Amino acid sequence: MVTIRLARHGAKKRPFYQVVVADSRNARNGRFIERVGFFNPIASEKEEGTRLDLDRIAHWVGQGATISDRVAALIKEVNK
Amino acid sequence: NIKSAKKRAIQSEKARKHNASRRSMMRTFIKKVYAAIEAGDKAAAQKAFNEMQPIVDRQAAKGLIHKNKAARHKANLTAQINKLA
Amino acid sequence: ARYLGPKLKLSRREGTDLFLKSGVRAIDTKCKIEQAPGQHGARKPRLSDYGVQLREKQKVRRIYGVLERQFRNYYKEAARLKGNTGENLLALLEGRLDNVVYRMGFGATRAEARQLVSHKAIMVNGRVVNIASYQVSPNDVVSIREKAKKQSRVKAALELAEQREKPTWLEVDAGKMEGTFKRKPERSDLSADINEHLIVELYSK
RNA sequence: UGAAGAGUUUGAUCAUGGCUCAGAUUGAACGCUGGCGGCAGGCCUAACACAUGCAAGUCGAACGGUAACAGGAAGAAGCUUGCUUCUUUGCUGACGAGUGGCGGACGGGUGAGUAAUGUCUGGGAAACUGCCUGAUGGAGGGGGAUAACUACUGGAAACGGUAGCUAAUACCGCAUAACGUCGCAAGACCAAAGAGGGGGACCUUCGGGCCUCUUGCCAUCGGAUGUGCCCAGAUGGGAUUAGCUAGUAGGUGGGGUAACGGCUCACCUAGGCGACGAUCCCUAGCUGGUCUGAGAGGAUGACCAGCCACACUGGAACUGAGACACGGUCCAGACUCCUACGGGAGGCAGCAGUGGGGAAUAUUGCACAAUGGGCGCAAGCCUGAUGCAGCCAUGCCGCGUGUAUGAAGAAGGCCUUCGGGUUGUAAAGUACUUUCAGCGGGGAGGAAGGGAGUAAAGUUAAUACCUUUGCUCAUUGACGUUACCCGCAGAAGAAGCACCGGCUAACUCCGUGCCAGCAGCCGCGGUAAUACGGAGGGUGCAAGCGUUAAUCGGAAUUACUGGGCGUAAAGCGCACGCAGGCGGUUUGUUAAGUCAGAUGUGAAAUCCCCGGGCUCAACCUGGGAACUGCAUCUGAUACUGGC
């Protein structure tokens, strides 16, 4: 199953997270098709914090890869 | 707790007594079709091949030889009855 | 390290006032620097061929309270953007937060100024800074925390700062204890107790 | 916007040739000393061996059912006729165990083997591809097994064996079936499951006929992404290994795999491979990376990201979408453990301790709080995954140990034909300064949501299901004594170690008297020891300082950038010459090689530029760049090879 999922990225007591498209299948943050964004749970309360390639995701969903509840909710942080 | 891999050799040997037995039956069926070419020619071979055709598909319907070998057997022998003059 | 030992014996051995333990009894005579000529000869019997720049290298370190490894790193960063180690090197030492707290007058000595910075009492652009080597730039605002603004030595240090030479490249207000950097210090004013052929080949010499 | 040189052959000197020192360094170790905090990393050795416990489950919204709990359903009695007892019961909420579906090859630990079918980097053809995702088809009928339970039974047991009995989203046939099968094509053939929540008229024995949405089940053919295969360019030592080989080298016929080839067999052929080092033997995780210096170059690849291999020692491969299976099978070997003695369990190079090995490498810590994966339609359950503490100058970075005052200069110490000098603003005495630590209180956020409220003129039959918003109630914090703020606190609790004849910074006096104790080289010590031990004063760095076996620099003294052969060290005593290296010149042509232009690729971290986040920075990153490479297309047409 090709899935659009959040990947393990950050520091001790400071998680950051990236989002990638991959068959899973593959292990943790590796061997991915392409990157589409980053979360940053803090994002310093600013509009230049958190990014998501909503148009490349629109070509990778369909008729494409799966997107689950917690990842389909990333659009709510960029709002949008 | 469980480890269901510990069941799979017993589940394979208990099934082997039909799932490998039918491999011997299928190796034999090729002999029955070539024996129907000497019985013989177009008025025996294609009548006898139609005893094998459904058994190959009915085995492939369960897995085991489904990826290529089932259709390979049918194509190989269709070409051998089509060769007749 | 801060050496922590007796101070005036260093300046007397360099024949040069290092501003160590300066103020009050140290102004107008009785510092005794270059007043003990010895009973026979210059006591240079001998003495070492590399004594310059070697003692000049300790002088330029000790007079700012700067350690070897950091002074060697200053000699490397000073070369960038055509800055020249005969110009930018001295302007980097004069632009230190411990020298800026000393030139704004909140410390009577560079040691006293460092001991306001490290003891969490100083701010740069409203942010608390404890790094004495922080480089103050031509837009930076330097000030003291409320817990220290009324300290005895800080008020006494400003009574000496008005008798010292004015640093024209900065501004300060003593009633708020807040000042601003307006220009980088320049060699056409910034002058030091060092000879002109020395510390221009620093390290590997 | 970077890049010390020198010493040593002598009575002197210029060369050359070796050797040596002054600087960096490690997963280190050693000595003395050692605070506050932060970022990393932490058995390199026995691929030696493991105590005691864990590390992997889940579904009652498929199903037979029920050891218990609780409510219904049904009988028998007391006479106290209104309060109780007795005898039964999956009908139902729920669920122990049982059937059945799915998961455990998620994601860790370790280099033993292999100079490679292996990493890095670029291609090719003959195949498969569950779940995801896309389109197109299909769902009638019959029959047989079996667990749990119970009664028997092997054995001292551990551990479960058997029989009687019964059902399917467990199983097989009989049916139906596409653009699939094969062919120019008509066409024949192969399969399977329902289930759940909601809900009206008609009817009953009212534990469903029937409507409705959801989600499954069986098949055909594409995408998406992997898996299997073969090549090319890159590549440790050895020639006092020069020859090696019998599936080695080519053909003919079978079998094998999803597919290929000698892949595996049986037979015909004798070739194949070698100085560009074949054959054989020793050593060995590889590269992103790391250290060094101005770089080139050198020494080297822990951790890190990715890839390939390994699971006590060894074989076979099987299951499944996937393992050439850490917690699997059949076990065998070496073993530990149990057995009072009739056979039985297992493999910490997981998480942690421990025996051993070592100069050496951290606690059987805390927690399902956060997150992921797994099962479940979902509530929810599992998780030594994971997320965090704990310890260590082991490397790197920010910071304390006080500050102010104070002398014709003290007492005490050192040096001195004893005048004087120096330790020294140092001390005491008197005041500041509470940074760091200590100590009490206040105290975030990391935690969203399910149930209820909500909200769309939701879905529909207007509160199921399904679906939406920001908030409330109640439940969810290991880290933790959090961060941060406020106060109580008093100089209080806080400094080392090496060095001082010449090179070489700082040096004098005492004692020892060639002895003792030293030394990078020249060399020290017999009455002035600047060389030992001390003492007084200086030099150096600092929570560090130092000593070593060694690697990089100095080192152009391994020489490519960039070595040398008359003698100092190497030119063969000589003649000819195969295989190698090299070769005038006019034309065309080939395009191996060069130069020019593109499209792919050169993983992510990361250098360097540069925007955020903590002061700077280690670190987490957001955007750029480079990695001159390599392939595939295409020009120039000059030189080299070729003809």
Q: What is the DSSP string of B21-83?
A: HHHHHHHHHHHHHHHHHTTTTHHHHHHHHTTTHHHHHHHHTTSSSTTTHHHHHHHHHHHHHHT
Q: How many CB atoms lie within 10 A of CB A71?
A: 19
**Neighbouring chains to A with at least 3 Cβ pairs closer than 8 Å:** none
Is the shortest CB-to-strand distance from B61 to strand D under 7 Å? yes
Q: Find, among C140, C133, C59, the residue nearest to C92 by Cα.
A: C133
As a rounded value in angstroms, the CA-to-C1' distance for B58 and D177 is 14
What span, in angstroms and rounded, lies between the C-alpha atoms of C56 and C66?
13
Q: Which nucleotides of D are covered by protein (CB under 7 A)?
A: 1-4, 39-40, 56-58, 102-104, 106-108, 127-134, 172-174, 181-183, 188-191, 219, 223-226, 256-259, 305-307, 318-320, 323, 325, 327-330, 371-373, 387-389, 397-407, 409, 421-426, 432-436, 445-446, 469-470, 495, 502-507, 530, 538-543, 603, 611-616, 619-623
Is residue A24 within 8 A of residue A68, CB to CB? The reply is: no
Residue C175 carries which side chain, given as an amino acid letter?
Answer: G
- Domain C94-180 indexed as CATH 3.10.290.10: yes
In angstroms, what is the resolution?
Answer: 12.0
Q: What is the DSSP string of C42-101?
A: -S-SS--TTHHHHHHHHHHHHTTT--HHHHHHHHHHTTGGG-IIIIIHHHHHHTBHHHHH
Domain-wise residue ranges, chain C = 7-93+190-204, 94-180
For residue C23, count CB atoms less than 10 angstroms from its CB and return exposed for 0-12, middle for 13-18, buried for 19 or more: middle
For residue C192, count CB atoms less than 10 angstroms from its CB and return exposed for 0-12, middle for 13-18, buried for 19 or more: middle
Which nucleotide is closest to the Cα of A5 by its C1'?
D372
Q: Do domains C7-93+190-204 and C94-180 have the same CATH topology?
A: no
Is the shortest CB-to-strand distance from C72 to strand D under 7 Å? no
Q: Considering only residues 29-58 of protein chain C, which place a Cβ less than 7 A from any atom of strand D?
A: 30, 32, 36, 46-51, 54, 58
Is the shortest CB-to-strand distance from A67 to strand D under 7 Å? no
Which nucleotide is closest to the Cα of B75 by its C1'?
D182
Q: Which residue is nearest to nucleotide D504 (CA to C1')?
A: C48
Question: Both tokens of residue C32?
Answer: 């005794």
Q: Fold for C7-93+190-204, please state it.
A: Ribosomal Protein S4 Delta 41; Chain A, domain 1 (1.10.1050)
Is the shortest CB-to-strand distance from B17 to strand D under 7 Å? no
Is the shortest CB-to-strand distance from B57 to strand D under 7 Å? yes
